[PDB]
Design a protein around this ligand. Structure first.
Ligand SMILES: Nc1ncnc2c1ncn2[C@@H]1O[C@H](COP(=O)(O)OP(=O)(O)OP(O)(O)=S)[C@@H](O)[C@H]1O
Ligand SMILES: Nc1ncnc2c1ncn2[C@@H]1O[C@H](COP(=O)(O)OP(=O)(O)OP(O)(O)=S)[C@@H](O)[C@H]1O
Ligand SMILES: [Mg+2]
Ligand SMILES: [Mg+2]
Lengths: 113, 333, 333, 123
DNA sequence: TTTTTT
């Protein structure tokens, strides 16, 4: 499973893709401390399944204006909330009329070294 | 219409099975008096309370195991003595060749009426137990250290020879041949087990027991007896503080544990357990180390209370009756 | 009525077992003279008193262990010498390859009548022990340093290879095969053991004996022998003060301890035990550093009093007869 | 890397070495190398990210120091917590404000360290 | 099934 950079929250790791549902496609290092309430910590690898269509409630890996992030998706018309899991942080409101918002895949597992 | 035909067919099948296999072959469970559980004393009131039913069941298989000098043989001889005090007949298959008749006599065992056998092989030991069970004249048989139940091939073999699971296979065959015989004869078989360490266990307790897995499945009650302290008379260790945990129970709730004292040359301190349980049931007032019964200060400390109780048997019998009445989960008839 | 039927069935069962397995296969514990415990001297009067029965039980298993240079080999050689003084035959399975015939002869062992063997593997040592036990001509066998009882696979293998508890399996199989033979043959087997550290223990005394858990369960008597100080003739260290704690006892009360002196070239200082045990029983008057006997001031200082005891055999005979009468709790004759 | 049972992230629970399955994870990814996996059951360790239901990778050792996160066993019951040893007393501190440290009286209770926590894998 | 090792 390939590692292709970090996440605003290098090597091939011998991890079975089938362990995740849906199957993980690639792993991302985590840089940040905002995903802590649901167990995603700084430095871990989060698993992503390459897809384009998701619904509300899932924790998703989004790309907002070429910047990568992970948060819980809440879609309401042309307004998206990438809710974080932390008291010290504030949610990132994507006004879906001026910013390009691309779903990259689903967070399906975490791995700590 | 249909239910009447079903009842007729069921009655015909029942009569056929009784004709083929005997009168007691098949019958309704609620009218089968042979399946009732009859319990026998363990020589320890706390252990009787922990077992739930009031002691070890009759006609079953019971395993007792623990580390070295934990009190397995002493507890077993107390069970045998309690069995003999009611007129029952008991047998001891000493496979360790480590039974002391004088010490057995000191515990309350009538040596002159105890059948003792020192088998050469595990097959001979298990066959002796089978014959004693089939006789029906022996109520309790104990097998010392099923870790000493060495197969005939292993005895005839050489040291370092590999007999992979041969003892386990022999133990499984013996349990298969013995369960029904013991149930039929209303005979309690107590297997004493030794503790070994299992290698390669990556998690949990590495402590296993000898004899394979059949004894685990076929034993109605399994006891883990351990030495948890020393009863010292200042600088001389005069007894052992021993805890027995009921790791398996088929006749009451499992995992209840008991604590008592084994005094060298006397056995289980029945009066100490009695005083402790009377305190537990608010029947003996314990102000610090002061034990009193109905206001009358029986003494100070466990040893003094035990001595006073021994000097006054009537209060001992009264407190024992009360404790057996209250704390027993499954009071025997 | 039913009692007579029970007695008849019991008699039939005993007859069946007796015909099947042998005359002495099963019989009541009271009339089994083969189960009587008969002991031999350990070379130390204090150790005999501490053991309770007056010595080490024949037909049983004894494990003696302690730190380095604590006197285990010397103690077992003294036991061998005491046995040989009674016409018995003894064998020394020297597994450590560290036996000195000159020192053994110095301690009183008749070297010409000691069957000394130096096994190449642990299996060879245990097979020799089994052969000696089955022969019936050897009354004492001493297996030196069961830590040196290395399995054959460990010998053929290379250093650094992992043999996960192979010696433990070998020792368990040996004890299984050997307990019955030793009991039937009336042979005392003494396993000398070493002491190793327990890695990552939390509570207390990370001491462990080599060879696994089988010897803990099978040894009738277990001794922890330690050196506690030096005995000096001025500035020359001429002996060692040794304390033996009976950690496990199956023939008498355990946990008693004894203290003696191992003099280099003489072994156990018996007369020092005699003096100390006479003092303990008021047979020898002790006024400060002075010892007296029946009014006669016999000396000052322990060494000079024991030298007196050397000088006159008569009073030594008197006092040893008396102390053996008053302190030996289980006299045989 | 085999999964060999559950470990209590809270009040210790009895657990047995049942090999439920073998998971295709490179043991070398953890330092030191993980020896087995345990299914976490509780939330006393969630502050560091060890949540209920995830697999704690454990490296089988017997010697650990203060401040490490270890898998200990007190009287046949296993738990995971930060170790703090002081003579005859032990403290298995959790990582949670709602939970309290678990004192082990190292004079009456059997206590055995069963490894070191070296990572977490969640499915 | 069988067994600890420092
Ligand atoms: N003859 C005896 N006189 C007095 N105390 C004894 C005697 N024999 C054993 N004991 C002690 O009584 C307690 C009960 O132990 P036992 O039941 O005899 O041994 P065990 O529990 O069967 O374990 P094993 O099989 O000997 S390793 C222990 O503390 C023994 O040291
Ligand atoms: N040939 C000898 N002459 C005199 N003293 C000796 C001799 N060999 C050993 N000793 C000492 O006598 C005491 C008894 O120790 P040993 O007889 O060697 O038994 P041990 O305590 O088991 O020591 P081991 O077997 O070598 S670990 C020790 O203090 C030895 O140093
Ligand atoms: Mg026993
Ligand atoms: Mg030596």
């Amino acid at each position: 499973l390939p590692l292709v950079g970090r996440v605003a929250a290098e090597g091939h790791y011998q991890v079975d893709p089938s362990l995740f549902k849906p199957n993980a496609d690639f792993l991302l290092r985590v840089s940040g401390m905002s995903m802590k309430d649901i167990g995603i910590m700084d430095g871990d690898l989060l698993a992503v399944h390459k897809t384009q269509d998701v619904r509300n409630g899932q924790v998703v890996v989004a790309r907002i204006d070429d910047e990568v992030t992970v948060a819980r998706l809440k879609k309401q018309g042309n307004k998206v909330e990438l809710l974080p899991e932390n008291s010290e942080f504030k949610p990132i409101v994507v006004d879906l009329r001026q910013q390009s918002f691309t779903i990259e895949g689903l967070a399906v597992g975490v791995i700590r070294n | 219409a249909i239910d009447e035909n079903k009842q007729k067919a069921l009655a015909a099948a029942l009569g056929q099975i009784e004709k083929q296999f005997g009168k007691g072959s098949i019958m309704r469970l609620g009218e089968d008096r042979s399946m009732d559980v009859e319990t026998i004393s363990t020589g320890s009131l706390s252990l009787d309370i922990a077992l739930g039913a009031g002691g070890l069941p009759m006609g079953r298989i019971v395993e007792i195991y623990g580390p070295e000098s934990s009190g397995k043989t002493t507890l077993t001889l107390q069970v045998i003595a309690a069995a003999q005090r009611e007129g029952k007949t008991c047998a001891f298959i000493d496979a360790e060749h480590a039974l002391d008749p004088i010490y057995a006599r000191k515990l309350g065992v009538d040596i002159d009426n105890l059948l003792c056998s020192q088998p050469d092989t595990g097959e001979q030991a298990l066959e002796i137990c089978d014959a004693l069970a089939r006789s029906g004249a022996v109520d309790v048989i104990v097998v010392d250290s099923v870790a000493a139940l060495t197969p005939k091939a292993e005895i005839e073999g050489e040291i370092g020879d590999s007999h992979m699971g041969l003892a386990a296979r022999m133990m499984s065959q013996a349990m298969r041949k013995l369960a029904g015989n013991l149930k039929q004869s209303n005979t309690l078989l107590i297997f004493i087990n030794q503790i070994r360490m299992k290698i390669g266990v990556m998690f949990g307790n590495p402590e296993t027991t000898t004899g394979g897995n059949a004894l685990k499945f076929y034993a109605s009650v399994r006891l883990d007896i351990r030495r948890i302290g020393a009863v010292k008379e200042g600088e001389n260790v005069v007894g052992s503080e021993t805890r027995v945990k009921v790791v398996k129970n088929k006749i009451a709730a499992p995992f209840k544990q008991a604590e008592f004292q084994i005094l060298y040359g006397e056995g289980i301190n029945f009066y100490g357990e009695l005083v402790d349980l009377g305190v537990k049931e608010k029947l003996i007032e314990k102000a610090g180390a002061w034990y009193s019964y109905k206001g009358e200060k029986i003494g100070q400390g466990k040893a003094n209370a035990t001595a006073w109780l021994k000097d006054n048997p009537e209060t001992a019998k009264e407190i024992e009756k009360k404790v057996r009445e209250l704390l027993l989960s499954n009071p025997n008839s």
